[PDB]
Enzyme design. Structure first.
Site, short mmCIF file in Angstrom:
data_model
loop_
_atom_site.label_atom_id
_atom_site.label_comp_id
_atom_site.label_asym_id
_atom_site.label_seq_id
_atom_site.Cartn_x
_atom_site.Cartn_y
_atom_site.Cartn_z
N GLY B 10 -138.96 20.78 -10.05
CA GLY B 10 -138.91 20.43 -8.64
C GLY B 10 -137.89 21.24 -7.85
O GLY B 10 -137.17 22.10 -8.38
N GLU B 254 -120.74 17.52 -30.62
CA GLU B 254 -119.65 16.73 -31.17
C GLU B 254 -119.07 15.75 -30.13
O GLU B 254 -118.78 14.59 -30.46
CB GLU B 254 -118.58 17.67 -31.72
N1 LIG Z 1 -127.88 18.94 -5.21
C1 LIG Z 1 -129.09 19.27 -4.77
N2 LIG Z 1 -130.04 18.29 -4.56
C2 LIG Z 1 -131.27 18.62 -4.11
C3 LIG Z 1 -131.60 19.94 -3.86
N3 LIG Z 1 -132.88 19.98 -3.43
C4 LIG Z 1 -133.37 18.72 -3.40
N4 LIG Z 1 -132.38 17.86 -3.82
C5 LIG Z 1 -132.49 16.40 -3.95
O1 LIG Z 1 -133.79 16.05 -4.36
C6 LIG Z 1 -134.24 14.88 -3.71
C7 LIG Z 1 -135.74 14.95 -3.46
O2 LIG Z 1 -136.38 15.52 -4.58
P1 LIG Z 1 -136.87 17.05 -4.58
O3 LIG Z 1 -136.40 17.75 -5.83
O4 LIG Z 1 -136.36 17.76 -3.34
O5 LIG Z 1 -138.48 16.96 -4.56
P2 LIG Z 1 -139.37 17.79 -5.61
O6 LIG Z 1 -138.67 17.83 -6.95
O7 LIG Z 1 -139.66 19.18 -5.11
O8 LIG Z 1 -140.73 16.94 -5.77
P3 LIG Z 1 -141.76 16.80 -4.54
O9 LIG Z 1 -141.46 15.51 -3.81
O10 LIG Z 1 -143.17 16.76 -5.06
O11 LIG Z 1 -141.58 17.96 -3.59
C8 LIG Z 1 -133.45 14.79 -2.41
O12 LIG Z 1 -133.00 13.47 -2.20
C9 LIG Z 1 -132.27 15.72 -2.60
O13 LIG Z 1 -131.06 14.99 -2.60
C10 LIG Z 1 -130.65 20.94 -4.07
O14 LIG Z 1 -130.93 22.11 -3.85
N5 LIG Z 1 -129.40 20.59 -4.53
#
Ligand SMILES: Nc1nc2c(ncn2[C@@H]2O[C@H](COP(=O)(O)OP(=O)(O)OP(=O)(O)O)[C@@H](O)[C@H]2O)c(=O)[nH]1
Ligand SMILES: Nc1nc2c(ncn2[C@@H]2O[C@H](COP(=O)(O)OP(=O)(O)O)[C@@H](O)[C@H]2O)c(=O)[nH]1
Ligand SMILES: [Ca+2]
Ligand SMILES: [Mg+2]
Lengths: 421, 440, 67
Positions: B10, B254
């Site tokens: 994701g 560990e």
């Molecule tokens: N730390 C950090 N968190 C992220 C980042 N991108 C997304 N998130 C977190 O991911 C959450 C949402 O999930 P995503 O990973 O963006 O969605 P996805 O994995 O692409 O899955 P889909 O909903 O199908 O698009 C949000 O609440 C963000 O806080 C990032 O680049 N860095």
């Protein structure tokens, strides 16, 4: 690419459709010839959402123009940008609908509908990854409301796993005297509750009240009203058209905005009609709503706020926290974090800083109750039922549209009264 | 041998993978094209960095990594970005339509269309390994892919690789950067589905990382770029024992022995210091004692919770850089007298210590000061259960009215999966209670 | 002690296998129940859209019957 197919039906449907394509064509740097004469590459990043790429680097709207009367058609062609639309994508009848929902839905529109469906498929099968559809139309005339909702149910049969999104214009006695309008609107609302995923409630009664009281127009024209509409439709599609994170597409909007499938009727807002606190306060004010409902008479299930322009994001964050804190009793407490906001850098033309507001508020029942009251003022007399029984319609079909919309209002009341404990 | 395969799932997982592999390359002197002038063993080797990098005969050092997203736009930036020469195209897997913030679409409707392809690509990495140790899975709790696709993947890996260890880095949602109102649902579903399939899971609370950036780095409105660069520093500290050699270098596995007293109690709390800007690190050298002390300051934790009001089941200190045991031992001795550190009555109170002498690196144009010594503390406290409690509360508010539940049911899920997942979380919060009660 | 040694290692094997087996069957059960469910919600959606077409026949039939 995530493509949207755009559909315009009927008198109101096609006029507000034209100004949408003019406004976003300009924001995306595309002239009436489909050529890109733009400044920045951000206009083309997501250009494929609303445009097909014809070689000769021509971007052609993915738009289907529909009406049961050729008059509205020929006006669009000669209009500004008329020659950017695919000529084959015009589908017009002759008989017209005579402001009769049953003519749009069952008889006349049913004869023309299979001809529009052919055009939908050509644009759809040509899509890398079809998001779904957006319809523009009135609920008060005949082609937009009746054939517009016939074409929804037909398109849903063929693409049940696509998002169906409509911009529905609602009749005010302040805008049209056509007496049969509370009938048409109630009959298509009956259809919109079953067969769309998202509906922006574009209330002519609010657009009139805005033009007269705020803009100070003693005689506001359909051209005045549609200025407010074009600015609103550009607002609420900003997240679809420019690079960004939240509500980047129609399904993610639906998932974030619609806690219950039937409660999918949105109250739009816009500001200005400015500082970041003024923008935030205005876009939440009843006077900037396009739905003609006071939010302080209900509660927000969910809200989306789009800020456009160059402004401090720290400031927008703090102001949006501010408005929830000081207005906390007007957001339902059993949906945590139910207000999302986006900032896009390009402001609309003319403005340096704009804000667009999308609300799912239980106060939208105010809009449905104004229509229900005009419906029954006629129905209890059986007034004008012949224009409908003559097309083949049963009487308890009006009873059902009625009780279904009364049900939609009861369910908004049900969740407005609900508590966490 | 001892290879680890990283899986980035994701948007959050992919973008945190960009930050981590860029940081790894800088730590190991690997160029964006993958050449590493120091590796004199062309085409292979058994050096410590080979646990994370394979080698081609043409000198390229290739991450042992797969990136997966159900849409293409995030991984397309890897394909064209600075490190595009680093990855073989087959390591970068995208669909055309994402999970739309919906766990059901990630786990079933969309994800089921790409899972075989993904497992094939992982299989091709595993078959290059002479002694595969396990997987590192990066993903958000909140997105439809990070939650639903990850747990579909974790189930499939238990099947294809049995008890082979699976570690997680999991992004716990925060309202300041969230993207969906349904993140509590996705969070509880993936936590329930993954619990049996994961050996160790490092939670990273976006609000904790967000506050650290605002408060310690003076970033008024942090981005994912700000957050990821801090996150990669913590990931780098946890993986440095795998990637570097050292006399005082204690293997992650560990520490794992000490971190997981029962299968389900496997969520260590991470705390990292020093997080400090160039402007403020200037003329200010932070000693072993100062950075060790910073680890018991709750404002430095990856997860918001209060270990002063819970109990410790373990405390590991992972130092890197200019650090010798004598200084560590002195710093620990003063923290014990001066700090609120209560252990459950059934485990020893010692602190387990590792020291990696390679000092921390920073990425150009970052906000972190380059420092001479750093520490990641990994502790197992009952307090991390507060983060479950907060998410379970948000889940209950919405589920009591079934808000948004139709989006999941329309994708083929049943309400019983929601209540089943929520009961597993209730039982997990109760497990965290029981491990903290005194014996009899 | 030798028989005990082979029992212990047979038990570790038997437990790893049973875990793989049950995860395998849990998953195929979920993927099958989810496909049935998704298909049933779609089929019910089409069924009532197709009722809309039977009612659109009924309504056009009345406008000729009454003329
Ligand atoms: N730390 C950090 N968190 C992220 C980042 N991108 C997304 N998130 C977190 O991911 C959450 C949402 O999930 P995503 O990973 O963006 O969605 P996805 O994995 O692409 O899955 P889909 O909903 O199908 O698009 C949000 O609440 C963000 O806080 C990032 O680049 N860095
Ligand atoms: N806001 C707005 N409303 C319109 C416009 N044109 C028509 N309407 C509304 O639509 C209703 C009539 O529907 P109509 O557009 O004539 O349907 P059609 O003739 O079949 O295309 C009236 O009650 C009007 O209030 C317009 O340009 N702007
Ligand atoms: Ca080597
Ligand atoms: Mg995504």
């Amino acid at each position: 690419m995530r493509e949207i197919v755009h559909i315009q039906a009927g008198q109101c449907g096609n006029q507000i459709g034209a100004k949408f394509w003019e406004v976003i064509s300009d924001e995306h740097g595309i002239d009436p010839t489909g050529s890109y004469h733009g400044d920045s590459d951000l206009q083309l990043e997501r250009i494929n959402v609303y445009y097909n790429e014809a070689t000769g680097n021509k971007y052609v709207p993915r738009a289907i123009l529909v009406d049961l009367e050729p008059g509205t058609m020929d006006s669009v062609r000669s209009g500004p940008f008329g020659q950017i639309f695919r000529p084959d994508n015009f589908v017009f009848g002759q008989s017209g609908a005579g402001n009769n929902w049953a003519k749009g839905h069952y008889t006349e529109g049913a004869e023309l509908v299979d001809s529009v469906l052919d055009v939908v498929r050509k644009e759809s099968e040509s899509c890398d990854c079809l998001q779904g559809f957006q319809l523009t139309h009135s609920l008060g005339g005949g082609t937009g409301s009746g054939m517009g909702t016939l074409l929804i149910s037909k398109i849903r049969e063929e693409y049940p796993d696509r998002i169906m999104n409509t911009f529905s214009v609602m009749p005010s006695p302040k805008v049209s005297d056509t007496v049969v309008e509370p009938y048409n609107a109630t009959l298509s609302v009956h259809q919109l509750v079953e067969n769309t995923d998202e509906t922006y409630c574009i209330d002519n009664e609010a657009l009139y009240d805005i033009c007269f009281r705020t803009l100070k127009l003693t005689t506001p024209t359909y051209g005045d009203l549609n200025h407010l509409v074009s600015a609103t439709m550009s607002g609420v599609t900003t997240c679809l058209r420019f690079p960004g994170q939240l509500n980047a597409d129609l399904r993610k909007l639906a998932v974030n905005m619609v806690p219950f499938p039937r409660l999918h009727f949105f109250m739009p807002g816009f500001a200005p009609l400015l500082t970041v606190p003024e923008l935030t306060q205005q876009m939440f004010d009843s006077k900037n709503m396009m739905a003609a409902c006071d939010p302080r008479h209900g509660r927000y299930l969910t809200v989306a706020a789009i800020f456009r322009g160059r402004m401090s994001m720290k400031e927008v964050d703090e102001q949006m926290l501010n408005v929830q804190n000081k207005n906390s009793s007007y957001f339902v407490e059993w949906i945590p974090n139910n207000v999302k906001t986006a900032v896009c850098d390009i402001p609309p033309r003319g403005l340096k800083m704009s804000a667009t507001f999308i609300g799912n508020s239980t106060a939208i029942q105010e809009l449905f109750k104004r229509i229900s009251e005009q419906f029954t003022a006629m129905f209890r007399r059986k007034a004008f039922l012949h224009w409908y029984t003559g097309e083949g319609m049963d009487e308890m079909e009006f009873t059902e549209a009625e009780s279904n919309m009364n049900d939609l209002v009861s369910e908004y009341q049900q969740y407005q009264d609900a508590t966490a404990d | 041998m001892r290879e680890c395969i990283s899986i980035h799932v994701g948007q959050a997982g992919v973008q945190i993978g960009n930050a981590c592999w860029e940081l790894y390359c800088l730590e190991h002197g690997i160029q964006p094209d993958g050449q590493m002038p120091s590796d004199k063993t062309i085409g292979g080797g058994d050096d410590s960095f080979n646990t994370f990098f394979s080698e081609t005969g043409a000198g390229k050092h290739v991450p042992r990594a797969v990136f997966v997203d159900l849409e293409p736009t995030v991984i397309d930036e890897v394909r064209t970005g600075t490190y595009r020469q680093l990855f073989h195209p087959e390591q970068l897997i995208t669909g055309k339509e994402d999970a739309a913030n919906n766990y059901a679409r990630g786990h079933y409707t969309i994800g089921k269309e790409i899972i075989d392809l993904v497992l094939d690509r992982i299989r091709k990495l595993a078959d290059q390994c002479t002694g595969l140790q396990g997987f590192l899975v990066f993903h958000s709790f909140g997105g439809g892919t990070g939650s639903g696709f990850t747990s579909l993947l974790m189930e499939r890996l238990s099947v294809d690789y049995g008890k082979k260890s699976k570690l997680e880095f999991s992004i716990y949602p925060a309202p300041q950067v969230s993207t969906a109102v349904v993140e509590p649902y996705n969070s509880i579903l993936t936590t329930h589905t993954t619990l049996e399939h994961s050996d160790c899971a490092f939670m990273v609370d976006n609000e904790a990382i967000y506050d650290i950036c605002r408060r310690n780095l003076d970033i008024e409105r942090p981005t994912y770029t700000n957050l990821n660069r801090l996150i990669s520093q913590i990931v780098s500290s946890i993986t440095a024992s795998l990637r570097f050699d050292g006399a005082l270098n204690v293997d992650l596995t560990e520490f794992q022995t000490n971190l997981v007293p029962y299968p389900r109690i496997h969520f260590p709390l991470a705390t990292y210091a020093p997080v400090i800007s160039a402007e403020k690190a200037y003329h200010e050298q932070l000693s072993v004692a100062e950075i060790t002390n910073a680890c018991f300051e709750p404002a430095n934790q990856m997860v918001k919770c209060d270990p002063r009001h819970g109990k410790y089941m373990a405390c590991c200190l992972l130092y890197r850089g200019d650090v010798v045991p004598k200084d560590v031992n002195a710093a620990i001795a003063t923290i014990k007298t001066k700090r609120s550190i209560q252990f459950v009555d059934w485990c020893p109170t010692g602190f387990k210590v590792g020291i990696n002498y390679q000092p921390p690196t920073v990425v150009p144009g970052g906000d972190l000061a380059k420092v001479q010594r750093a520490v990641c503390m990994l502790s197992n406290t009952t307090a991390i259960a507060e983060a479950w409690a907060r998410l379970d509360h948000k889940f209950d508010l919405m589920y009591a009215k079934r808000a948004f539940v139709h989006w999941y049911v329309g994708e083929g899920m049943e309400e019983g999966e929601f209540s089943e997942a929520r009961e597993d979380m209730a039982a997990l919060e109760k497990d965290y209670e029981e491990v903290g009660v005194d014996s009899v | 002690k030798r028989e005990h040694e082979r029992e212990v290692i047979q038990k570790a094997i038997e437990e790893n296998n049973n875990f793989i087996k049950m995860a395998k069957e849990k998953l195929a059960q979920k993927m099958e129940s989810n496909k049935e469910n998704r298909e049933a919600h779609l089929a019910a959606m089409l069924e009532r859209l197709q009722e809309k077409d039977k009612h659109a026949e009924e309504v056009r039939k009345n406008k000729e019957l009454k003329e």
